[PDB]
Amino acid sequence: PGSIPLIGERFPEMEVTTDHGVIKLPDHYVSQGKWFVLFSHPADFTPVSTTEFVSFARRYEDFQRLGVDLIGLSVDSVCSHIKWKEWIERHIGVRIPFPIIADPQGTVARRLGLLHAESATHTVRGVFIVDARGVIRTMLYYPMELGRLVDEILRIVKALKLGDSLKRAVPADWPNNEIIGEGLIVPPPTTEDQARARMESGQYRSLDWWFSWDTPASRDDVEEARRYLRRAAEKPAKLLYEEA
Amino acid sequence: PGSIPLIGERFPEMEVTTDHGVIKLPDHYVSQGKWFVLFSHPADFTPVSTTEFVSFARRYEDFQRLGVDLIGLSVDSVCSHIKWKEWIERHIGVRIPFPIIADPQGTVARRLGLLHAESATHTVRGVFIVDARGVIRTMLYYPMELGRLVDEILRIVKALKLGDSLKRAVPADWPNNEIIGEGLIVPPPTTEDQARARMESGQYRSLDWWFSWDTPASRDDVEEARRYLRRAAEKPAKLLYEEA
Amino acid sequence: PGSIPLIGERFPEMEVTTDHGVIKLPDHYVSQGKWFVLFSHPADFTPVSTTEFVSFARRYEDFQRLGVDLIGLSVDSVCSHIKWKEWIERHIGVRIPFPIIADPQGTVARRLGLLHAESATHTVRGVFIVDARGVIRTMLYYPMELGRLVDEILRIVKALKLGDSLKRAVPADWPNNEIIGEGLIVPPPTTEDQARARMESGQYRSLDWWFSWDTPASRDDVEEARRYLRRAAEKPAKLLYEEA
Amino acid sequence: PGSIPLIGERFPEMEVTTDHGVIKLPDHYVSQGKWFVLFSHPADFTPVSTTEFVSFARRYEDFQRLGVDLIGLSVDSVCSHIKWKEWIERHIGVRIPFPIIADPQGTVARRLGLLHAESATHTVRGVFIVDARGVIRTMLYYPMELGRLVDEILRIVKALKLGDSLKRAVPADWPNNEIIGEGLIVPPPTTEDQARARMESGQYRSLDWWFSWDTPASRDDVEEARRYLRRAAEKPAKLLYEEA
Amino acid sequence: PGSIPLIGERFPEMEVTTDHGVIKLPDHYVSQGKWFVLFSHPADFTPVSTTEFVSFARRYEDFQRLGVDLIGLSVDSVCSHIKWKEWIERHIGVRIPFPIIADPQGTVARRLGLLHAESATHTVRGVFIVDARGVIRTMLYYPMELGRLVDEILRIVKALKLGDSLKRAVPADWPNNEIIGEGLIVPPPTTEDQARARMESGQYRSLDWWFSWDTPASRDDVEEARRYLRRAAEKPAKLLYEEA
Amino acid sequence: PGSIPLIGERFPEMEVTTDHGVIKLPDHYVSQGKWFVLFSHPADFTPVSTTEFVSFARRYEDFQRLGVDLIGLSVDSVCSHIKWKEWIERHIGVRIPFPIIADPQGTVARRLGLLHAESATHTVRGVFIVDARGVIRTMLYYPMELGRLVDEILRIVKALKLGDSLKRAVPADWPNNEIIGEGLIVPPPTTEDQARARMESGQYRSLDWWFSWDTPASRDDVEEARRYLRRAAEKPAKLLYEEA
Amino acid sequence: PGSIPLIGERFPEMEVTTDHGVIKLPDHYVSQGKWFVLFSHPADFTPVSTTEFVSFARRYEDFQRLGVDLIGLSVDSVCSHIKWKEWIERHIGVRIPFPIIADPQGTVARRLGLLHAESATHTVRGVFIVDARGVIRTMLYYPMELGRLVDEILRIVKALKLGDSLKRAVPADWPNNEIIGEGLIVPPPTTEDQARARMESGQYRSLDWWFSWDTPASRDDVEEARRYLRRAAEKPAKLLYEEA
Amino acid sequence: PGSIPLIGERFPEMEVTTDHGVIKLPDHYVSQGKWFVLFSHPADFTPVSTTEFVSFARRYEDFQRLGVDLIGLSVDSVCSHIKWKEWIERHIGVRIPFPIIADPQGTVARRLGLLHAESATHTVRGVFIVDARGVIRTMLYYPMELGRLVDEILRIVKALKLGDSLKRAVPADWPNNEIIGEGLIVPPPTTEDQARARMESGQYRSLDWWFSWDTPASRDDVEEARRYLRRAAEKPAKLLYEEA
Structure with missing residues (x-):
């Protein structure tokens, strides 16, 4: 098994590096009166993950109507994140407007229990739904496949x-x-x-x-x-x- | 602050008491070549939980056709499970055909990380999707509300x-x-x-x-x-x- | 192989959830200058337990005359407690006037040594007689049968x-x-x-x-x-x- | 708090010295197909204890009808047990026919949890009802008074x-x-x-x-x-x- | 082996229950400017022990004239002590005027090393000679026989x-x-x-x-x-x- | 604050150096069917110790009649013991016929609990009475004075x-x-x-x-x-x- | 500080994932009689790292002529490695013919001491020169800049x-x-x-x-x-x- | 199996004995706004080490133009260092102008990770390039050969x-x-x-x-x-x- 944060707990306090800059979670979103959905994917330039980024981007306005911000997470670094986004813009015609956390040593991954037995190295398809108080409301763990x-x-x-x-x-x-x-x-x-x-x-x-x-x-x-x-x-x- | 079983792991070996009798998980289902969905609810004679049991019972044939069985879990005892199912059949006209685990000491709940901060005493609305090799494939944690x-x-x-x-x-x-x-x-x-x-x-x-x-x-x-x-x-x- | 509170000890400090609300023991009774009898039963909708609630209910006025309050206890939740009492009033024509503690994770059960080898998950028929100073005076342990x-x-x-x-x-x-x-x-x-x-x-x-x-x-x-x-x-x- | 053995557990294997000789518990009774009630009292030449010994003696034949043997227990030694018995025969006209365990270091008392907070040195009025398989069936703890x-x-x-x-x-x-x-x-x-x-x-x-x-x-x-x-x-x- | 207090050490500070009441050793005697001889015997209503109590009682004035008090000790309880002294007075014609400690859990015995391999449960015939400053001056250990x-x-x-x-x-x-x-x-x-x-x-x-x-x-x-x-x-x- | 061997225990196995040679206790005396009395004294060329050696020497015949051997013990060396014995024969006219253990690091002394508070360096006046089976039967601890x-x-x-x-x-x-x-x-x-x-x-x-x-x-x-x-x-x- | 493997030691035994597949170090090279240079870079699509890969690729034949293989390392993943190589081939005209280790949880980086205070998440520019016996011969640590x-x-x-x-x-x-x-x-x-x-x-x-x-x-x-x-x-x- | 200080870390505070007297690192160079290169060599009067000292001495001017001081390190004592420099001046005609640390018990060597498997006793050819703020900017480990x-x-x-x-x-x-x-x-x-x-x-x-x-x-x-x-x-x- 492994450890996780729990529904009804405050999302753990953490500074994270994203392709939009450094942000504190959950404070960055609380201060805007915003909910956020933190979601993870195994690696950049992977196909299921690419289809999910496009799905989230198509639905970005629907999330904005609810006062909800999106933030991704993989163990790949910022420059890989930005190259992958550019590839999606060029080849699929879809701009990804939300940040992606770079988590190379799996520090965020281990804190949110995003490393399952399916892979020692790459997060599964985790989803944290966090309200405007920074409280975890719902958690989903989908697999690589x-x-x-x-x-x-x-x-x-x-x-x-x-x-x-x-x-x-x-x-x-x-x-x-x-x-x-x-x-x-x-x-x-x-x-x-x-x-x-x-x-x-x-x-x-x-x-x-x-x-x-x-x-x-x-x-x-x-x-x-x-x-x-x-x-x-x-x-x-x-x-x-x-x-x- | 809680431990979960992980995607890609064998569902933890355990004997559970259901309103259908005592079974071994995941062996009981592995032996029949079945997948199973184990899901939890906070308590018997609660309204959201009742709407969920009716939804699952309406879908039971759809699960069976897929080679998938259903098993519930709350901290209530077997006699409460049977009285609640009688209540649902009499007042709503729906028979619940699948077993419910009785977990009064929270032994099963602590093994599966089903006790979150929303309630120290009652499980959240957890979902374990387990394949016919007894391997956890997906996990969902919905809240009480x-x-x-x-x-x-x-x-x-x-x-x-x-x-x-x-x-x-x-x-x-x-x-x-x-x-x-x-x-x-x-x-x-x-x-x-x-x-x-x-x-x-x-x-x-x-x-x-x-x-x-x-x-x-x-x-x-x-x-x-x-x-x-x-x-x-x-x-x-x-x-x-x-x-x- | 189990610890207990002892005669001459203060009833241990605890907050308990009953079908009447949340109380502090033994403070809630000490504050009124009342004795209480705390007694346990294995589960709601069990027959020996039903006979004992009806026996206590018939004796409620006799306890009341000595300035003794009654409080029950099982590992079942509040909604099962209220449905059980409703079944008793409907089918036996006896109203149970005293609260029942709901102890779903066995927190109280483990504190009072009410979990014996007869059942890992259900309380035997324990009896704690506590005076107006909050002191345990007598303890009885009856079995399930x-x-x-x-x-x-x-x-x-x-x-x-x-x-x-x-x-x-x-x-x-x-x-x-x-x-x-x-x-x-x-x-x-x-x-x-x-x-x-x-x-x-x-x-x-x-x-x-x-x-x-x-x-x-x-x-x-x-x-x-x-x-x-x-x-x-x-x-x-x-x-x-x-x-x- | 303090430790006790539990309903459903085999009476703890032990050699005790009594005023009838050394017996193994529970084997000495199991081997005759007899139940026994082991009961404790704080000390010899105490008035409530004397009333209880006389009560048990008067009911000796009712116990033998059920195939139940009686055995007592205090921290007093064998010679005190025999002098006390002689005093009850001489002054009250009642023979005590059943053995009394001598427990000077409280070796048996600590095993059976008979030392409560009312006295660090004398046992409370414990009752262990033990069936002919050597299994504890019921435990009662009455106080000194x-x-x-x-x-x-x-x-x-x-x-x-x-x-x-x-x-x-x-x-x-x-x-x-x-x-x-x-x-x-x-x-x-x-x-x-x-x-x-x-x-x-x-x-x-x-x-x-x-x-x-x-x-x-x-x-x-x-x-x-x-x-x-x-x-x-x-x-x-x-x-x-x-x-x- | 087993631990003791030693010659030249202060007699251990302790409250003991005697058939004359509760006293603090060595303070009770120090505060009077008196030496004391604390001596142990296995059990009340034993024959060597009785001969030793009579020998001390005959020599009581010789001790008193030296400014020395006597105090006995066995694992027997106060009521047993008083009944034993009544027996000696009535059957031997000798009054025991000095106190006997009651040590039923062996608390004093373990402190003074009075439990030897001859008996797990009753003290040997220990003698502690204690001066008016509360200092152990001499120790004798005689056996049961x-x-x-x-x-x-x-x-x-x-x-x-x-x-x-x-x-x-x-x-x-x-x-x-x-x-x-x-x-x-x-x-x-x-x-x-x-x-x-x-x-x-x-x-x-x-x-x-x-x-x-x-x-x-x-x-x-x-x-x-x-x-x-x-x-x-x-x-x-x-x-x-x-x-x- | 000291550990002692106990009445009923076998005298601890040990090899000691005496002014008669190396011997094994208790086996040297057990072999002969002899009891022995091991006694200690703080040091050679001290006057109370000298009076005690002369008293033991005069009574040697009474000890030999009972099939009892005598053996002394101080922290002094073998040379001192020989010089001391030679002084007693020359100045007092009494031959010390029995051996004395030399215990320079107090190895024997600590094992027998012969170092008390009166002196951190020299042994009190201990007496071990040991029977022909090598069992300690009685122990006496007299002080330096x-x-x-x-x-x-x-x-x-x-x-x-x-x-x-x-x-x-x-x-x-x-x-x-x-x-x-x-x-x-x-x-x-x-x-x-x-x-x-x-x-x-x-x-x-x-x-x-x-x-x-x-x-x-x-x-x-x-x-x-x-x-x-x-x-x-x-x-x-x-x-x-x-x-x- | 931090821990490193040392000159004269065997390169630690490890299975690594590269953009050419899974290999065991140092066995994969030892079994061919090849030396290898394992070097690290902080992240893919970084400009200094790109100049270094081009420099190594230009000198690839010089290395091959000495019987030396090259293997890179960063915490980026295999897909990121291959896209970065494609970029270099397309925009610089230079094909990278040697493998790059993917080290997303920094498992290899920690084993080899490649995480320095300049960055908690990305390796510095490490160089391990390993001989055909699998022995570390020389280590260099260049910084990010x-x-x-x-x-x-x-x-x-x-x-x-x-x-x-x-x-x-x-x-x-x-x-x-x-x-x-x-x-x-x-x-x-x-x-x-x-x-x-x-x-x-x-x-x-x-x-x-x-x-x-x-x-x-x-x-x-x-x-x-x-x-x-x-x-x-x-x-x-x-x-x-x-x-x- | 070795520990090192890391790029980005302050050079560890230490007092070192050199052949120019005691200096504090890095403060001695930080004080002067000077970078320093600290390098090690196994032992004085070794041929590769001699060629290295000569190469550093002849480049001293180039190091001085950059505001870089040099400082050597071996496990040899200050007298050996001075005899070695005299030998280089006399037989090669090159004066060594910079100090050498004497590290007889490998205090400095162990702190800088300069003892590798190639010799338990003598330092490898380590190089620490430390800037004017006393930060380690680059580390090189060449071997003995x-x-x-x-x-x-x-x-x-x-x-x-x-x-x-x-x-x-x-x-x-x-x-x-x-x-x-x-x-x-x-x-x-x-x-x-x-x-x-x-x-x-x-x-x-x-x-x-x-x-x-x-x-x-x-x-x-x-x-x-x-x-x-x-x-x-x-x-x-x-x-x-x-x-x-």
Whole structure:
């Protein structure tokens, strides 16, 4: 096994070198009132990693609408990062606008547990979702051989921010949940007195005293979440390889 | 501040008590030639967890068809697991067919790093995808306040089985990748000789010696994967709360 | 092979989550000048445990009259505790009025030595009798297979309270001791001069200088304690399973 | 705190010196197919301890009916044990037929955790109920100031032995339980398949799939157990101090 | 082997429970300007031990007249001590007026090295002679099978007090030394100059510069010591077993 | 602050250099079926030590009659021992026939715990009484300022040999015990069955079941032990200083 | 400070990943009878490193002619190495024919002491000259800001090989030493007999018994070495930036 | 198996005994605004070491022009150093003007990592180039059997001082680099913003945004550096051996 930071912990304090300059994490993003998604890839000039950078870049505006910044990470150095970006700009027609951390001695990698048994030398496809307080909200470890579904990363941040802003929990497969649809869950009672007050209140649709929900998300909130999933499910209109 | 098992490692040898009896992991599933998805939830008779069990139960046939079994985990005991499943079948009309681990002392939870800072006593929403050799392939850690997207778990398992059988890596957002669509990536050359040989075979479409791909997945495999994402993107025709 | 708290020790300082909320032990009871009985059971929705909650519930007023509060404990979570009590009130027609601690990681169980070799993950049927100063006075460890005698727990608390106020030791089987009946024992002399002086005073009935007693308990005190034992001896007029 | 052996563990292998000679525990009883109750008292020529020794002696034949032997324990030496026994025979008219362990260095006391904070030098009123396989079944810790209810010790050994022979769990306050009276509880199902097979059997009375029971105890078993409690509840005919 | 306090060290600071109450050693005696003889015996109601208690009691005035208190010690408890003294008073006609320490966990015994290989559980027949400054002057260890010669304990104390007050060393077998009779020895010179001065000054009988003596002990001092040995040598006119 | 060998332990294996040659303790005496008395003195050419060597020398014959050998010990060298013995024969007229260990680095002294607080460099007046099996039977520690009573060392070996051969314990002050005179004590019963059998057998004089004795020592054994004490008590006929 | 391997030691046993594949050092070269120069550079697509790779590639045949292989090293990955080589081939017209180690976790850099205080993450410009036995012969540490003089690296391996072949030491600045020109030094005598015999044999030119030399190097070996230094001294007629 | 101080670190503080007296390193040279080259040699009166001292002595002027002092090091004592220098002056006609450290117990050698496997006892041919701030700028380790090229030591210090004053990196083989001749390299951009600003400024000749250079070294700086290399490549005019 290996060590990791945990959901509910402050992202560990660290200075990192990127292709945009030196930055402190998580302070650089807190100070801007921004969430960030830190994600890792094994090495520059690798194909699955290249497809993921293009996916993130296509979705950069959707992340900006949510007040979310993107930052990559591999063990390759800054000049390799910049050459790889230039190659993607020239050959695929896509500009990567977000920084990439250079982590040559694996210092960041070992701190975030991004070195798995699949490779002693190269990080797996780690994803840290960090809110504007610098708190880790969600962690995903995908392997070398499988690209990420970047639309699920938008769904996660949109639903987490909706949860925070309405004091609600978010049901499976939201906003297309099979029980309550675009409904959001009221945090259950934690005492018998709260359980009673809730059974007697009639304020919410309920299946039991522990399962109440309402529909407090705006139609804009619901449809933007659904658009991410519709894009994931859509056959692309024109493949970028064709005009390359 | 927590330890996890790692991608590429054997799922740790353990005996667990489920509401179906005592089993050895990963042996029980390895012996049947099955993959398994082990996932955790904080406690029984909690609403997000209930929406997730209903989502998994709706997808159970989709998992079975792939040669994949499901096993749950919370810190609650077997009698609570059985009462909760009875509750779901009676009040929602859905039978949960797969076992749930009872982990009251958190033995399993500490082994798998499922106790994060969000709760000292209750597991987060962890997901271990384990192949038929008993090897961990992917790990996801969703928080208390956010339900999983279960269709992404199906897409991960399908893309992994495809990549394993076709000897390919899977691009971002497969089968709807913006660069190569349903194409799968040839693992890149590891030497200058292999790179020269690959580029002077023209056996594959390529953007560079390190980015080659073909389209070896069948119509059926591709459409199966697209079915998962289309179900994720679509609002269900009727909601299960109406039927209660 | 396990540690325990000891008679004469302060009940250890701890914050516990109950189905009534968060409390500090023993402070929450010391602050009210109340004794408490903390008792454990293996799991919610187990039958012997259900019989014991119903027995405690029937005796709640008897405990209340001595200024003794009740608090249960199992490794199950709050929501399982509230659902279990709801099942008891619905199916047996008895409301459980006292809190149950939820101890999902066995933190409290390990602190009080409630995990024995009968089960690695579930608490035996422990009983801690703690006075208004927060001091452990008596400890009982019943196994999984055997319900407690709750009337003996009343008789212990009543006899302890009498012993403390009257400055007496309590004979075997009080208030029906075969030697001295409802007599209480004068703490024996600790010196030769004290022994000679106790014998020369002839203030008490004696069998020897180390064995003096008197009858200072009131008729109401003795009758209260004899009531507990008569209820334990007599078959209930009507069984609750009947009107179910 | 302090250390103790636990319910479900084999009584610790040990040679003890008693006023009947040296015996190995638990082998000396195992080898005769006998249960034993080992109990402790702080010191010889103490008044509460004397009342308890007389209680146990009066109930000697009730213990032998159950195939249970008695063995005592204090930090006093053999010659003190024999002088104390002679004093009880001479002044109270009661022969103590069962051995007492001499534990001068507290070697046995420390092994069984009989030294609590009430006294660094004298054992509290410990009770270890040990079955004919040498397994600890129940442990009670009464303090210096409070004599035991010896009839509850008979009720425990009778109920444990009945549970063992009829493969049943014993409800609270048996044989006077307020829900099922003299009924004994069928150990609950541990799987969903068994829970369903049980509720389709209609083989037993049931409040739910986890709360089944029947009435397999002999009327002799029931009335003997009730008789221990009726004796506990009975004002004695003639106090033994009268005739001294 | 095993650890001890040594001649010339302060008797270890300790609080001991006696049948006369709690006292602090050596303070209780130092604060009175009294020597004490602490002596041990294996167990109360043993026959050599009884003969030794009677021998000390007969010599109690001789000890008191020298400004020496007696205190005993066994692993037996206070009540046992007092019952044993009652037995000696009633059956031998001798009152034991001095205190006995109760040492049930062997705490004092381990401190004073009174547990030898002859018994793991009961002290041998240790004797600690302690002066009015709390300083250990002499230590004797007699075994279980052999009663002490109490007159030699009187001789040791009288000779040590004479040596201290007259600034002399005491010859072998004093006051019946075969070379110098009742003579006492001048501590020898420690320098060549002191040797020359002494071997010139002619103030003392000498066998050499290192062997000088005088006779500074009063006739009553000498006769007091002779009387201890004369009592040792003479068969008592009447044996206490006869007049019982 | 010192470690000692214990009664009941084998005398520690060691090779010592004496003024008679190198010997192995205890084996040199065990080989011959001899007891030995090892005694120490602070240094050669000290006056108390000289009186003690002369007292041992005069009693050599009494030691040889009991099959006891004598062996001395100081931190002085073999040359000093020979010069010292030659001085005693010339100036006092007494041959020292027994060997003295030379212990220059205090190797033997530290092993036997003979370095006490009185002197960090010179041995106190230790006595080890060792039987023909090489077992330590009694230990005495006299200080620098006080010579031994050698007749008590004879009485100890005599009483011990008599106790061993007759299977008896020896009362206080034997053969002049004030309760039973020259009587020897039968080891007390260790069980109730032995107590009752012994008492009703009438075989011995008794004061109680734990205090039995007879008179199995020959008149010669008794009068020899008494002569030691008579000699200890007698004013010597003529002093050796006068004819010196 | 930091740790290094040393001249005269075996190059540490290690498997390394290069852009030509996986090789074992030093075995891969030892098994071919080849020397190797392992050199490091901080990162790919850095300008000093690029000039050094071009210098090495220009001298590749000079190295091959001596039986010396070249192997580079940086913490950049294999794909980055190959893209950097392509760049050099495309923009400078120079093919890099030798392998580059990929050392992303700095496993090799730490083993060889290539991380200095100038950078925590990137190796300085290290040079290990390793002979055909696998033995380290010479180590150079150039910093980030200063490219190496590759002709001195040729002079070192040429001179070491001559010295090994001819059993000679090589004077400062060989083959242009100011004292002995192209002379090689005879290893000095290690004894006075050798010193006398060396001087008397008149076999060598000599300044003293410890300073003898001859001229055993072929004209071709000398001119090869002089050609390395003349190349180092002469400005190229055409600069490669002008043919880009 | 050796430790070294590193490039970028301050030369370690040490007091060293030389043949010019005690000096403190590096403060002695830092004080004067002087760089120093500290070099080592195995032992005095060894032939390769002699050729090296002569090569340094004859280049002393070139070192003085650069504000560089020289200091030697061997394990030989100060008297040997002075005798050795006298021998070089007398027999070769060359005065050694710089000090030599005496390092008899290898204190300095061990601190600078100058003891390698080639000799446990004698130092290899180490070179520490230390700047006027007392920082280590370059480290060379030549072996016993190979003399240094002292002109490369001048070239290093000349190139380092030039890089420092013009803020430039020095290409391979400067001033005869095969790509840019006497061109000096601008440190590469560390961000994409800097890369773009530099490429659209057109201020520098470039091969790419990471490879910019200009020619800001004076004709004198370039020709002085090139003279070092011309000297190294020139067959000496007359060998000093003939004059000796």
